[PDB]
Design a protein around this motif. Structure first.
Motif, short mmCIF file in Angstrom:
data_model
loop_
_atom_site.label_atom_id
_atom_site.label_comp_id
_atom_site.label_asym_id
_atom_site.label_seq_id
_atom_site.Cartn_x
_atom_site.Cartn_y
_atom_site.Cartn_z
N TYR A 6 26.47 54.27 6.55
CA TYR A 6 25.61 53.54 7.48
C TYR A 6 26.36 52.32 7.98
O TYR A 6 26.74 51.45 7.20
CB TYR A 6 24.31 53.12 6.79
N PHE A 7 26.57 52.26 9.29
CA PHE A 7 27.35 51.20 9.92
C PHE A 7 26.42 50.24 10.65
O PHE A 7 25.51 50.67 11.36
CB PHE A 7 28.36 51.77 10.90
N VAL A 8 26.67 48.95 10.49
CA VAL A 8 25.98 47.91 11.25
C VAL A 8 27.02 47.08 11.98
O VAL A 8 28.00 46.62 11.39
CB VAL A 8 25.07 47.05 10.35
N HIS A 9 26.83 46.93 13.29
CA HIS A 9 27.70 46.11 14.13
C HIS A 9 26.87 44.99 14.75
O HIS A 9 25.74 45.22 15.18
CB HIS A 9 28.36 46.93 15.23
N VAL A 10 27.45 43.80 14.81
CA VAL A 10 26.80 42.65 15.42
C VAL A 10 27.49 42.40 16.75
O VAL A 10 28.65 41.99 16.79
CB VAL A 10 26.87 41.41 14.52
#
Lengths: 48, 41
Positions: A6-10
């Protein structure tokens, strides 16, 4: 994550813009020395 | 398909209208080509 990653990018996402005009680069009157922007822009106030 | 032909054509056309860029900034195509050529050498 279940069976994966699971990837989170800001991000950045600018939301309010303005309408101005810039130049290719300010230089001397007789083209002696000329400058250009380094990650930025050149904007006149209104009185040069 | 999900999008109509005109939808995909409009997305492609908006992609065509942002190639200029450089240095966002709107530029003539000749100036953008010149700035692209200056980077090669």
């Amino acid at each position: 994550a279940p069976n994966g990653f699971y990837f989170v990018h800001v991000g950045y996402h600018p939301t309010d813009y303005v309408n101005q005009t810039s130049a290719y680069g300010l230089c001397d009157s007789s083209n002696t020395k000329c400058i250009a922007a380094k990650n930025g822009y050149f904007i006149k106030n209104g009185s040069d | 398909p999900l999008y109509d032909s005109n939808m995909e054509a409009m997305y492609t056309a908006s992609l065509t209208g942002s190639i200029a860029g450089a240095l966002a900034a709107s530029l003539p195509f000749a100036q953008s080509i010149y700035y692209r050529m200056n980077g090669i050498g």
